[PDB]
Short mmCIF file of C-alpha atoms (C1' of nucleotides) in Angstrom, two decimals:
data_model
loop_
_atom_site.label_atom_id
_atom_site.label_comp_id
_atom_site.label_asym_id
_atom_site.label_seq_id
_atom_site.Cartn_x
_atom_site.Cartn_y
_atom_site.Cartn_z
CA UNK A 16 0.00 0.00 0.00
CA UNK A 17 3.27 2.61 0.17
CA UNK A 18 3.94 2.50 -3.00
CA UNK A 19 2.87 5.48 -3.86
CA UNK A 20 5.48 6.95 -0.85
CA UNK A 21 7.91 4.92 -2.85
CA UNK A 22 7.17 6.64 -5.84
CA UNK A 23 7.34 10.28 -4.31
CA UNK A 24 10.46 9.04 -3.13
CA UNK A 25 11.41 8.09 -6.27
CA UNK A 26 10.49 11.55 -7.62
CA UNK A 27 12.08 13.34 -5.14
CA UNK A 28 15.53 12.50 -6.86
CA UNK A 29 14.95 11.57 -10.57
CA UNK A 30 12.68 13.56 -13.07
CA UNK A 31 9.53 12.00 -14.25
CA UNK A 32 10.36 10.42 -17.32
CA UNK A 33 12.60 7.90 -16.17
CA UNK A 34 11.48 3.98 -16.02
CA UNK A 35 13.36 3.11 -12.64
CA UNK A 36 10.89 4.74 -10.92
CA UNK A 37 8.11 2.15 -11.33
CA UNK A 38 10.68 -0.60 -10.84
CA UNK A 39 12.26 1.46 -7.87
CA UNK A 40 12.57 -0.69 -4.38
CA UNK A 41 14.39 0.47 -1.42
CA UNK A 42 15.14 -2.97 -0.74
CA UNK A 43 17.31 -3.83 -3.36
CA UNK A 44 19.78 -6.41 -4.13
CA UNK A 45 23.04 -5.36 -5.93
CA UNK A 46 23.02 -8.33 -8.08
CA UNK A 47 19.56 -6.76 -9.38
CA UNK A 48 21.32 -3.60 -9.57
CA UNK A 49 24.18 -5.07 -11.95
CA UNK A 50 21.14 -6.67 -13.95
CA UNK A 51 19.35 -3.12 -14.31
CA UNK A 52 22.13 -1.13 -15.21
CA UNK A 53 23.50 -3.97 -17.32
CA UNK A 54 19.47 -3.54 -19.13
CA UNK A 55 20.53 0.34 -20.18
CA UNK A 56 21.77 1.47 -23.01
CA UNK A 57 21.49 5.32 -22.56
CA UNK A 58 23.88 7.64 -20.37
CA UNK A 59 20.39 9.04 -18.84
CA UNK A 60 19.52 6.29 -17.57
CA UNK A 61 22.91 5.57 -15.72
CA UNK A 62 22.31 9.41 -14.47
CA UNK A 63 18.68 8.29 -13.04
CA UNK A 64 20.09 5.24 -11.73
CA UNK A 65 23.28 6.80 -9.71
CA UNK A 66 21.14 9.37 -8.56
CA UNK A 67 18.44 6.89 -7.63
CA UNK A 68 20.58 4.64 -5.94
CA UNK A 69 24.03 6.34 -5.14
CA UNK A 70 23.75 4.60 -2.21
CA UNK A 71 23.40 1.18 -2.44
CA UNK A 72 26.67 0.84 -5.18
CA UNK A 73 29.56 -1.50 -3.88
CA UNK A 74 32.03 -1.59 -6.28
CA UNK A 75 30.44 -4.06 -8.73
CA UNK A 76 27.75 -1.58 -9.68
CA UNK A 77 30.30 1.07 -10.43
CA UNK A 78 32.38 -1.72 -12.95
CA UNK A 79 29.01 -2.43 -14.43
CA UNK A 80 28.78 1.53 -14.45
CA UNK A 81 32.07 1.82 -16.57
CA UNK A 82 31.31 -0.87 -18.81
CA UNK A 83 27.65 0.75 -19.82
CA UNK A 84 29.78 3.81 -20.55
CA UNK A 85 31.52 1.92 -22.98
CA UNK A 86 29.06 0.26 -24.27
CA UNK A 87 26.97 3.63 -24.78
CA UNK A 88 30.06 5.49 -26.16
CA UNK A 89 30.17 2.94 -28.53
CA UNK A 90 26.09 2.46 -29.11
CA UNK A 91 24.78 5.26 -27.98
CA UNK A 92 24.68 8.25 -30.64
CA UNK A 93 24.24 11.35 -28.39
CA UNK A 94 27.37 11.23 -26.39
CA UNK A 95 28.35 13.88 -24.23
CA UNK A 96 32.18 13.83 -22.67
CA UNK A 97 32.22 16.39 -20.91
CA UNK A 98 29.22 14.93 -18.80
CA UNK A 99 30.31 11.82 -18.91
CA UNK A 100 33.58 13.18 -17.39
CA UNK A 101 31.69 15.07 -14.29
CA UNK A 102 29.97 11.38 -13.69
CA UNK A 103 32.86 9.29 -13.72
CA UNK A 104 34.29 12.76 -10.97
CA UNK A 105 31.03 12.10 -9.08
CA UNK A 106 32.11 8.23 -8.57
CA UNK A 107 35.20 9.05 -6.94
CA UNK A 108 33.81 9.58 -3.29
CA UNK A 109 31.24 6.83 -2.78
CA UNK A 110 34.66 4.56 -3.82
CA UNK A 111 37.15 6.41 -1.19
CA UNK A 112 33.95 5.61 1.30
CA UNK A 113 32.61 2.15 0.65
CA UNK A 114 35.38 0.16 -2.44
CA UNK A 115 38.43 1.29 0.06
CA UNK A 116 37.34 -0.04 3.05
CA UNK A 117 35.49 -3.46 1.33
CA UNK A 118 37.30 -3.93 -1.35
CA UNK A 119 38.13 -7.35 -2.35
CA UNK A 120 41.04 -8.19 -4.79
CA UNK A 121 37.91 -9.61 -7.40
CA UNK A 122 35.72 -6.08 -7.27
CA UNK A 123 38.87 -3.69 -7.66
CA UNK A 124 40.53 -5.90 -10.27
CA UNK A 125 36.80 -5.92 -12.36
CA UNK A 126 36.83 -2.00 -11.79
CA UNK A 127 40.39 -1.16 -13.24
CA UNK A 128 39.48 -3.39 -16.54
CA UNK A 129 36.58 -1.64 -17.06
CA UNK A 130 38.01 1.68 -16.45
CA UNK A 131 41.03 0.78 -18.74
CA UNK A 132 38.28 -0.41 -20.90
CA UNK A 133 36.97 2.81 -21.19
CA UNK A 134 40.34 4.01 -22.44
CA UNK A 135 40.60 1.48 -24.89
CA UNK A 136 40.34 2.26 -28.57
CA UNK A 137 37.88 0.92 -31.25
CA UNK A 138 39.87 11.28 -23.69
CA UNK A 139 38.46 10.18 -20.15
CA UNK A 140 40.41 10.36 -17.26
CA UNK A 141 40.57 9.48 -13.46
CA UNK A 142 42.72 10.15 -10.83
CA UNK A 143 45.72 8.28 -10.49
CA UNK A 144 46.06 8.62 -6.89
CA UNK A 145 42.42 6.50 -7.05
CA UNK A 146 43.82 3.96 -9.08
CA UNK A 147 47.29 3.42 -7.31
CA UNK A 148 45.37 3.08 -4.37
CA UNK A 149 43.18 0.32 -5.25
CA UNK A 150 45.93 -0.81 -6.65
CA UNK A 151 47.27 -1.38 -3.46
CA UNK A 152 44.14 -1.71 -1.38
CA UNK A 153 43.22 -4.76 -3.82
CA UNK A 154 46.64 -6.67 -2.91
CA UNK A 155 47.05 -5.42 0.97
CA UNK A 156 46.78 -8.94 1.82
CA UNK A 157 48.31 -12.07 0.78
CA UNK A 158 46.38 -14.64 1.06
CA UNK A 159 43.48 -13.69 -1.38
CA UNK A 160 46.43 -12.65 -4.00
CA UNK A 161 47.52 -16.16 -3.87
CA UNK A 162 44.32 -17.69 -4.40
CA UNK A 163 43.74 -15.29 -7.49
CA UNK A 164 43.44 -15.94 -10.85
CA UNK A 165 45.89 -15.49 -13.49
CA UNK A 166 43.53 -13.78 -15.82
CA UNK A 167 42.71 -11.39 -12.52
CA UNK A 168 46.32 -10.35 -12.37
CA UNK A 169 47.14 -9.85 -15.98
CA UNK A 170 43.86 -7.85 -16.02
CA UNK A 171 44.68 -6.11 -13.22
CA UNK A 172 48.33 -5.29 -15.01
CA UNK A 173 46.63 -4.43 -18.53
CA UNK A 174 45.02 -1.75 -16.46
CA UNK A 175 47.45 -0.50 -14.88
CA UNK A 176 49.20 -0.34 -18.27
CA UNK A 177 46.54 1.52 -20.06
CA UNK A 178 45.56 3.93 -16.97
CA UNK A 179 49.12 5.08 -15.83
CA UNK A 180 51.02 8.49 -17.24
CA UNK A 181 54.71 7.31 -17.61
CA UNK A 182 55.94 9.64 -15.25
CA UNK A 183 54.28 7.78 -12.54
CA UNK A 184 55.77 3.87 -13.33
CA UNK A 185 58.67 5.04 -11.24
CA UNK A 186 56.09 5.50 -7.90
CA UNK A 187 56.35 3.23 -5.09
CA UNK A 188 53.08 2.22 -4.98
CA UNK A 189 52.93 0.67 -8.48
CA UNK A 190 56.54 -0.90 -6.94
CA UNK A 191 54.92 -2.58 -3.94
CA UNK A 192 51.95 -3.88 -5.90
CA UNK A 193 54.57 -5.46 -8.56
CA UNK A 194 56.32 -6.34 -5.38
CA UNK A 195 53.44 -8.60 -3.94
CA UNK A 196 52.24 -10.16 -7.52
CA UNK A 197 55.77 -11.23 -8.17
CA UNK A 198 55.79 -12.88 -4.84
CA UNK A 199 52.24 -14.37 -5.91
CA UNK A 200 52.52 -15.39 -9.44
CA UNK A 201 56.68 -17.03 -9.56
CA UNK A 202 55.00 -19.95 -7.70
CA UNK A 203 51.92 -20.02 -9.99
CA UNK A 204 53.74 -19.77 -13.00
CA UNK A 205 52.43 -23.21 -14.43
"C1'" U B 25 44.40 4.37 18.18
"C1'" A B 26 38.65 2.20 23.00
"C1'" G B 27 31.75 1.81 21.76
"C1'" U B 28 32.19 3.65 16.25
"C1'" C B 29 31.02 2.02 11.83
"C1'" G B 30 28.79 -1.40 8.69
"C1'" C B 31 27.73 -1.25 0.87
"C1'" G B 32 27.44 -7.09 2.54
"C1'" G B 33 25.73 -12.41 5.61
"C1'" C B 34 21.95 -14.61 9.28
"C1'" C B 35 16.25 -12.68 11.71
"C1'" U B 36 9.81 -11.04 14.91
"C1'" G B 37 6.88 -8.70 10.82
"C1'" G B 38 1.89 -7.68 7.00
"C1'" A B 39 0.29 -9.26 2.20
"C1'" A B 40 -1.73 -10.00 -3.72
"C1'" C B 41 -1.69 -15.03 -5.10
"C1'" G B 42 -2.56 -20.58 -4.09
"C1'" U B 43 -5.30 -26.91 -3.04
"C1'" A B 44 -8.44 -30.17 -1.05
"C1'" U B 45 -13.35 -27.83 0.82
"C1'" G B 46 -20.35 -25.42 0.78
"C1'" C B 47 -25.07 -24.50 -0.29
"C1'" G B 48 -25.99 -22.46 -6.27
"C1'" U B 49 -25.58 -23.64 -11.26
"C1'" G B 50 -23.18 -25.89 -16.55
"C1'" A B 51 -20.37 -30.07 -19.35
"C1'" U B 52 -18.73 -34.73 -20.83
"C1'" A B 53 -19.04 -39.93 -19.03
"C1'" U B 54 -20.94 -44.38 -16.58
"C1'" U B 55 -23.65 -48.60 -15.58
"C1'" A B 56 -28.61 -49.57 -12.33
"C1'" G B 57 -33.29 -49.04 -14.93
"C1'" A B 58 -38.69 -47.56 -14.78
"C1'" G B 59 -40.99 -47.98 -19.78
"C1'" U B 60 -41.80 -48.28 -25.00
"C1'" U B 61 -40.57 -49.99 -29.76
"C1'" G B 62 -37.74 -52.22 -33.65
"C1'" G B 63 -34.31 -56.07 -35.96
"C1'" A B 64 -33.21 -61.23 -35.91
"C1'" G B 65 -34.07 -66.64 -34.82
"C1'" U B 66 -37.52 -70.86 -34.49
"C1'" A B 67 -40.61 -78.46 -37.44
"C1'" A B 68 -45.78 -78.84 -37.78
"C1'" G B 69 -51.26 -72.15 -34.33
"C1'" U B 70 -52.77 -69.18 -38.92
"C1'" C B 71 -55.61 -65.15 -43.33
"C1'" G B 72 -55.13 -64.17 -48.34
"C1'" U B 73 -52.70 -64.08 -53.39
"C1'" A B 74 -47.30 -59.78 -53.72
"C1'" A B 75 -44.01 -62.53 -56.95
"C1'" C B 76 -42.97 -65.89 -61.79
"C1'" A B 77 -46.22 -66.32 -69.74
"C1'" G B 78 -48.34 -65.09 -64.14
"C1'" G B 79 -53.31 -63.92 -64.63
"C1'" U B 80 -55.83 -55.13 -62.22
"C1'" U B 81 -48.29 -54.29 -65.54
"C1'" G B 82 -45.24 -53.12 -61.31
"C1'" G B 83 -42.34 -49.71 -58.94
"C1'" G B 84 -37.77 -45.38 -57.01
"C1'" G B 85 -41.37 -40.96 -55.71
"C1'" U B 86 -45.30 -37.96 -52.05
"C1'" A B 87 -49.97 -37.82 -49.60
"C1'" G B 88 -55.15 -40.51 -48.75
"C1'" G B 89 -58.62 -45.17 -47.79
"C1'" G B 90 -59.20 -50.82 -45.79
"C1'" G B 91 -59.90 -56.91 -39.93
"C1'" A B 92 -55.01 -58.46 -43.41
"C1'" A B 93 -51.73 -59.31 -48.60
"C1'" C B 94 -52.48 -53.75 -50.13
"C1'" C B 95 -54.90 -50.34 -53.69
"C1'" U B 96 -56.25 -44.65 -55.29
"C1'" G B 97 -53.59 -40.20 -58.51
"C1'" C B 98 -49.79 -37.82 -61.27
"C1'" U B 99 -44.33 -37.63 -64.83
"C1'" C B 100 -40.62 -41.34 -65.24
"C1'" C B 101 -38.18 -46.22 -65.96
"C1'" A B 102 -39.29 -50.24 -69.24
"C1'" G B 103 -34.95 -53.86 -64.85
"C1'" A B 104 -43.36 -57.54 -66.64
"C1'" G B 105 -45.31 -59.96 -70.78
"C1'" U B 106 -45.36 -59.72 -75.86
"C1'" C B 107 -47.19 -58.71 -81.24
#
RNA sequence: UAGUCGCGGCCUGGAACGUAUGCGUGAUAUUAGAGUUGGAGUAAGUCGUAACAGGUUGGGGUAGGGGAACCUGCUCCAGAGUC
């Protein structure tokens, strides 16, 4: 019987021509979250989902995020970089408050492919303090980089190749990280 | 750096919907069978001549009349005789 409080909930943060606000729950799951912005195609609709539900992203939904931004800069006619470029600024907090303290090696790697993605070609930019910090937030501990996946670490190196300026290779942060996936991946080799 | 914090895992909650189920009121299906009528079978109960040159020349047809076999019209067919 509250849906119709949902839905002027719903409309107090997303204009009324959007379709998320029918399918709008508070209650949501971020696997149906990865499904709903993985049904989009437009760059407003990933505008009235983040600002629908800026506050139920872990870092899945935000590598979802990057890859629909591919996926419309290469699908969508009408694309706009410049607000495209303020989005991708807006998704730099709810990381430094939510993907740096529960990051897992899995969710960080799957972000710096997609972002590295978005850089690929067939010019947006982040921080690199942001991404030598996951960097090193995603390998902080051992024991998950050892159980990781080859494909993980190479993709987690192709980004780190594609995001990087070369004036920054010579940083000790990129040194540690190389320090711990050497110390991973000499045993793995095979 | 010591009560925070908690996107994420486990938990009292309401609820559309969802059998079997009840008096209404439909379908298909079943044998019980009131009760009527027809087909068939049968050595000796029985009334007349349909049928055959065959003794009123019969009949596919549609209605009438008679205790019974039946006959009465109207076009046809000759798949009844026969000069």
């Amino acid at each position: 019987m509250r849906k119709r409080e949902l839905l002027n909930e719903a409309r107090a943060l997303v204009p009324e021509g959007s379709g998320w606000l029918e399918a709008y729950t508070r209650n949501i799951s971020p696997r149906q979250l990865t499904w709903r912005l993985g049904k989009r195609d437009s760059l407003a609709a990933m505008t009235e989902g983040w600002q629908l539900y800026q506050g139920k992203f872990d870092t899945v939904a935000m590598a979802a995020l990057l890859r629909r931004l591919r996926h419309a800069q290469l699908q969508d006619p009408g694309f706009d970089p410049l607000a495209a470029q303020r989005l991708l600024d807006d998704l730099v907090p709810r990381l430094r408050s939510v993907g740096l303290r529960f990051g897992k090696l899995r969710d960080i790697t799957a972000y710096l492919h997609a972002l590295a993605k978005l850089r690929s070609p067939a010019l947006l930019t982040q921080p690199d303090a942001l991404v030598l910090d996951l960097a090193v937030f995603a390998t902080r501990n051992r024991t998950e980089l050892l159980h990781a996946s080859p494909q993980r670490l190479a993709t987690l190196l192709w980004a780190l190749m594609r995001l990087l300026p070369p004036q920054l290779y010579g940083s000790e942060q990129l040194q540690v990280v190389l320090d711990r996936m050497a110390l991973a991946s000499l045993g793995r080799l095979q």
